[PDB]
């Protein structure tokens, strides 16, 4: 079973911890010593729900669960220390999300208001590429009257329209009416909402689609070295990061834009007919002057040439800087196999480190610890890609004085 990292978002008090606690209790792996004590507590109080309350407190004291198809690990949601930094560095990363929305009168409205976190987290989920969001419309037992279809539809309609207005796709968004404390429509079908005829939240989690595999994405091969072999020809070497290279393929070298044909491929001094992601290969290319090939360049197929950036926008964490950095700062960026000086061309905004939202627009400077959106202009043509399109070519380190000054993920490229 594939492992996925899941983030649960939503407004304060809407039911996130409870829902998380319910999933862990019903499909997770709580230690025997903890389960036991929880059962003991429920026994002494003569109330079954005391078990869940006991477990919730234990969990809070401190997170993987299993469904029909997947293994899920619950990770930090916005509001936590290093939330943004960990997503940028790749220390954490969300594969799927559940937005918890309270159906209780007033709560739903507060969450969806201008300053509310339901609206904030939906926009954040859009920035994170969480197109398969599952929206749990929770506290269905607290509508007036309890389990009200009309209130659930109103919420589903309003949230859906809001999402559409933010580009947030929608055909992959699923809504389910639930009650977190009891697991109703979460880990079992509710007997209280006969009007709902859709999948349970766990069933929606099992409907999640895994992202495209590198082998099915366009070819990208960052070049690590290039040699000239007498009587053989030009032989670049690099690791396939996405796509498939095959003997006979026409390929293009960027940034130069030169086209050549692959005559052979080898890995480990062994000829192969095809190379797939992960394969470190030497490949003989006919038609290209070695002077148009260098370490840092990137190969692709002519129909999908590697992107070359005139400018790019990134979300960065400044991990180390002794004073302050400003517009014009020009460190060396290391991205895939390239090492190129890139000038900071705009400090777009600093971000709140716990949430990802904008905090100061156009700051004069960034200091160590800051997270920000920044634009860079490579001093010479540089191949890069958006992180959410080709990860291996979209995360970089800013280096200076032998140290990593910062790490960033690329979120936009102005092609050359
Ligand atoms: N009646 C009812 N209470 C709920 C439900 N979900 C959560 N709660 C309660 O509402 C409060 C807020 O929930 P909490 O999970 O801590 O949400 P959080 O701030 O989003 O993590 C808790 O005190 C729960 O007991 C629900 O579906 N029905
Ligand atoms: Mg909570």
From Swiss-Prot:
EC assignment: 3.6.5.3
Region listing for G5, in residue ranges: 179-181
Region (G1): 10-17
G4, as annotated region: 138-141
Disulphide bond pairs: none
InterPro entries: EFTu-like_2 (IPR004161), G_TR_CS (IPR031157), GTP-eEF1A_C (IPR054696), P-loop_NTPase (IPR027417), Small_GTP-bd (IPR005225), T_Tr_GTP-bd_dom (IPR000795), TRAFAC_GTPase_members (IPR050100), Transl_B-barrel_sf (IPR009000)
Catalytic function, reaction form: GTP + H2O = GDP + phosphate + H(+)
Function summary: GTP hydrolase that promotes the GTP-dependent binding of aminoacyl-tRNA to the A-site of ribosomes during protein biosynthesis.
Record-stated family: Belongs to the TRAFAC class translation factor GTPase superfamily. Classic translation factor GTPase family. EF-Tu/EF-1A subfamily.
Protein name per its UniProtKB record: Elongation factor 1-alpha
Species of provenance: Saccharolobus solfataricus (strain ATCC 35092 / DSM 1617 / JCM 11322 / P2)
């Amino acid at each position: 079973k594939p492992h996925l990292n899941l983030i649960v978002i939503g407004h304060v008090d809407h039911g996130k911890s409870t829902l998380v606690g319910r999933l862990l209790m019903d499909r997770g792996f709580i230690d025997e010593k903890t389960v036991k004590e929880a059962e003991e507590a429920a026994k002494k109080l003569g109330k079954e729900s005391e078990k869940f309350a006991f477990l919730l407190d234990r969990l809070k004291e401190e997170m993987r669960f299993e469904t029909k198809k997947y293994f899920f690990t619950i990770i930090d949601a916005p509001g936590h220390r290093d939330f943004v930094k960990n997503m940028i560095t790749g220390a954490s990363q969300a594969d799927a999300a559940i937005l918890v929305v309270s159906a209780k009168k007033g709560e739903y409205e507060a969450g969806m208001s201008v300053e509310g976190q339901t609206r904030e987290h939906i926009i954040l989920a859009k920035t994170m590429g969480l197109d398969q969001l599952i929206v749990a419309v929770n506290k269905m037992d607290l509508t007036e009257p309890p389990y009200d279809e009309k209130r659930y539809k109103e919420i589903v309609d309003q949230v859906s329209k809001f999402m559409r207005s933010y580009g947030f796709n929608t055909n992959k968004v699923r809504f389910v009416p639930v009650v977190a404390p009891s697991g109703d429509n979460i880990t079992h079908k509710s007997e209280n909402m006969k009007w709902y005829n859709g999948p349970t939240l766990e069933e929606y989690l099992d409907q999640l689609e895994l992202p495209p595999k590198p082998v099915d994405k366009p070819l990208r091969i960052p070049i690590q070295d290039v040699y000239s072999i007498s009587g053989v020809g030009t032989v670049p070497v690099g690791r396939v990061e996405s796509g498939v290279l095959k003997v006979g393929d026409k390929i293009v070298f960027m940034p130069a834009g030169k086209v050549g044909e692959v005559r052979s491929i080898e890995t480990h001094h062994t000829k192969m007919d095809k190379a797939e992601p992960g394969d470190n290969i030497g490949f003989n290319v006919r038609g290209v002057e070695k002077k148009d090939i260098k370490r840092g360049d990137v190969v692709g197929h002519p129909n999908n040439p590697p992107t070359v950036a005139d400018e790019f926008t990134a979300r960065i964490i400044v991990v180390w800087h002794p004073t302050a950095l400003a517009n014009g700062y020009t460190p060396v960026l290391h991205v895939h196999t390239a090492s190129v000086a890139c000038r900071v061309s705009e400090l777009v905004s600093k971000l709140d480190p716990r949430t990802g939202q904008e905090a100061e627009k156009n700051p004069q400077f960034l200091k160590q610890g800051d997270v920000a959106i920044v634009k860079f202009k490579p001093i010479k043509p540089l191949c890069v890609e958006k992180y959410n399109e080709f990860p291996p070519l979209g995360r970089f380190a800013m280096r200076d004085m032998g140290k990593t000054v910062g790490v960033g993920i690329i979120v936009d490229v102005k092609p050359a």
